[PDB]
A paper describes a structure:
The multiprotein membrane attack complex is a bactericidal weapon of the innate immune system that also modulates inflammation and proliferation when formed on self-cells. MAC assembles from soluble complement proteins in an obligate sequential pathway. Based on structural similarity with bacterial homologs, the giant (110 Å diameter) β-barrel pore is formed when helical bundles in the Membrane Attack Complex-Perforin (MACPF) domains transform into transmembrane β-hairpins (TMH), although a molecular mechanism for how this occurs is not currently understood.
The asymmetric region juts into the lumen of the barrel like a “paddle”, exaggerating the MAC’s split washer shape. C8γ is wedged in the crease between the rotated asymmetric component and adjacent C9 oligomer, and may limit the rotation of the paddle. Masked refinement from signal-subtracted images followed by sub-volume averaging was used to resolve the averaged C9 monomer from the open conformation at 4.4 Å. We observe density for many of the reported glycans on C725, C827, and C926, which line the β-barrel’s concave face. Here we demonstrate that complement proteins within the C5b8 paddle rotate with respect to the nascent C9 oligomer, which in itself varies in curvature between the two observed MAC conformations.
Author numbering:
A (entry chain W): 18 to 224, 242 to 535
B (entry chain V): 344 to 535
């Protein structure tokens, strides 16, 4: 079915925003299209320049507290020239009249390629987590030691990250099962009948006069019937799944009293306040729907494969044989004094019948499905494990250590604790509260606007997915592809008709 | 697990009938004859067989390891899993590796609100406040407040996802589908 996209509900022009200088021609998404028809990725939202009519007196002061930075942030108490990089490389270190007093004397190596990038913007409707929506390099005061890890090295923990652990947790599972089904049935029927008849009568008369007559008759018949039926079917099924993860480290982002990056701060400052779903939908795709309150660096791998077996056998044999025969004898002889008369009539007739039938039909079905995935670490050591894991049957001792070192070099998320974005907006801003509830309504409308819930349901219980407009449905193993219309299992057709030529 | 069932039935019946009639009458010069013979047999046959075999197997393997450097640790893991040949030097390497980097085994526990410094600004009230907070935390959200799974599946809680670990002989999420369906048998005559 060529289902089109009814995706143009237009709204009325709202009031112009004087400070932002933008209009809010609105729109909404209604229909995606479940089948191979017209794909429609038309984004919701529209902008327009407008002549401002209000004086735009609202403005964000420079926090009225201390030295303003070059981007809009402020020093709290000790963000002066003390080796505390907040704004830029030399932006905060622009001019230093006093001596460059170091904040810490001990040698603490910077957090290299570790959870330092703790911000993640995973989309619940989308895919893997995003980058950091905030600044994670800023630090407040005295260094907080992180004296832990594999080797003897000291890392730094930013003031935005509340906690980080180096627990090298690791677990894996295995499972397997077996199913078996078998049925057999034998049937045999035989019939036997035999019929025979006799008829003999003789008549002779003699009181010259003489008379003699004799009748003879016979009969033969038998009908043997035979029937045979057989049935057999076997089924087997095996399903199992395994998974394993190598955890590297875990962190918990501080919920409140959070510092933000200059780009996100500028985006929140240049943000409307009259429920502009158009710009809010863009901001949502740009900076994710909700950030991570706590993550889990590392990597996981899993392989699954499935087995299914089916068989059917049916046999039927029929035999029919009939024989019927008839016998008759007539003899009459008459005698004069000198006269003799004779008569002899004999009749013989037999009939035979034969019939044979056979049915021999075998059917077998097999279904196998295998899936596997892996992620994390360097590309060399990661896929070297993948090639030997898939049907290798011989695991090495050094390859796992190489994988461990590789994932220590480059980890990836495993477990992610979630937190909404509208709780991350900075407080006491220009219009923080109204923007907070506005972004809350925006994320609610995003999560309830378009999903599998609003699309159409597939057939045969096919799990429906949504991959950028294409509302395809994953069809089961025993069934065929798109739309789950054609079965793919057609009962074998049999024609015992006589060949034409 | 294995199961085998066999049933065989055989039925055979034969019935036959025989009759002979002969009558002869004689005159002084008159002769009358009569001969009537009847024969009829009947045979019956029936056969039945049932042959059904079923077998089930279930295997589950789990293993884990932790501690030490990543090189020496997983070198022990690869040779332990179905290796059947343990070395003498690999255990010493594992010992040196875990001496380099150990990990927790047994942990004696103590509440945090007992760790707050005394004679602070509002130490005592903050102490009981954090005690009430940890009590509300430990009694607020857990498996106790979530819903119970099916077939005695142990329910876990991993960051909101209140999944339940289903037994080995059973299938996955929600423990709804059995995964063990009694084999189906149809002795019906083939349509075509
Ligand atoms: C129906 O007939 C087939 C004939 O192929 C049977 O398969 C076997 O075939 C070989 C060689 O053709 C014979 O020597 C065997 O005797 C056959 N088996 C049996 C049990 O007779 C098949 O088994 C028959 N029945 C079904 C249900 O297919
Ligand atoms: C039911 O019939 C099957 C037929 O396969 C029996 O399995 C054996 O099969 C072989 C070859 O087909 C025969 O030579 C054996 O004689 C069969 N075994 C026996 C004991 O007769 C199977 O054993 C039968 N019974 C069950 C419960 O399945
Ligand atoms: C005639 O009689 C004989 C002897 O009783 C019997 O065996 C036979 O079946 C009968 N019918 C015939 C020969 O058609
Ligand atoms: C029935 O007639 C068929 C035809 O040849 C023969 O083969 C069979 O033996 C007969 N059965 C009996 C019981 O007479």
């Amino acid at each position: 079915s060529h289902i089109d996209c009814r995706m143009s509900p237009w709204s009325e022009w709202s009031q112009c925003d004087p400070c932002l200088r933008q209009m809010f021609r609105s729109r909404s998404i209604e229909v995606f299209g479940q089948f191979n028809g017209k794909r429609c990725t038309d984004a919701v939202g529209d902008r327009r320049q407008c002549v401002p009519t209000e004086p735009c007196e609202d403005a964000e002061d420079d926090c009225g507290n201390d030295f303003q930075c070059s981007t809009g942030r402020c020093i709290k108490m000790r963000l002066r020239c003390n080796g505390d990089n907040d704004c830029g490389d030399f932006s905060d270190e622009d001019d230093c009249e006093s001596e460059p007093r170091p904040p810490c004397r001990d040698r603490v190596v910077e957090e290299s390629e570790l959870a330092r990038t703790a911000g993640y913007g995973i989309n619940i409707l989308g895919m893997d987590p995003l980058s950091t929506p905030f600044d994670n390099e800023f630090y407040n005061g005295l260094c907080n030691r992180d004296r832990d890890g594999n080797t003897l090295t000291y890392y730094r923990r930013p003031w935005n990250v509340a906690s980080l652990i180096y627990e090298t947790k690791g677990e894996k599972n295995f499972r397997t099962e077996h199913y078996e089904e078998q049925i057999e049935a034998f049937k045999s029927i035989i019939q036997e009948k035999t019929s025979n008849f006799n008829a003999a009568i003789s008549l002779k008369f003699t009181p010259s006069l003489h008379g003699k007559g004799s009748f003879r008759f016979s009969y033969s018949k038998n009908e043997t019937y035979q029937l045979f039926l057989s049935y057999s079917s076997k089924k087997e099924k095996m399903f199992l799944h395994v998974k394993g993860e190598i955890h590297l480290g875990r962190f918990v982002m501080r919920n409140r009293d959070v510092v933000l990056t200059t780009t996100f701060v500028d985006d929140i400052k240049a943000l409307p306040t009259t429920y502009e779903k158009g710009e809010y939908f863009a901001f949502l795709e740009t900076y994710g729907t909700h950030y991570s309150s706590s993550g889990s660096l590392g990597g996981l791998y899993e392989l699954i494969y499935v087995l299914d077996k089916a068989s059917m056998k049916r046999k039927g044999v029929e035999l029919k044989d009939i024989k019927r025969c008839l016998g008759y004898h007539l003899d009459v002889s008459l005698a004069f004094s000198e006269i003799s008369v004779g008569a002899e009539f004999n009749k013989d007739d037999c009939v035979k019948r034969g019939e044979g039938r056979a049915v021999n039909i075998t059917s077998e079905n097999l279904i196998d499905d295998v899936v596997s995935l892996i992620r994390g670490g360097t590309r060399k050591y990661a896929f070297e494990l993948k090639e030997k894991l898939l049907r290798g049957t011989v695991i090495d001792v050094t390859d796992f250590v190489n994988w461990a070192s590789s994932i220590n070099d480059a980890p990836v998320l495993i477990s992610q604790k979630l937190s909404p974005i509208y709780n991350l907006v900075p407080v006491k801003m220009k219009n923080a509260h109204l923007k907070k509830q506005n972004l809350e309504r925006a994320i609610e409308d995003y999560i309830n606007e378009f999903s599998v819930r609003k699309c159409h349901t597939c057939q045969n219980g096919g799990t429906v997915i949504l991959m950028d407009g294409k509302c395809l449905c994953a069809c089961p193993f025993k069934f065929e592809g798109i739309a789950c219309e054609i079965s793919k299992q057609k009962i074998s057709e049999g024609l015992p008709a006589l060949e034409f030529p």
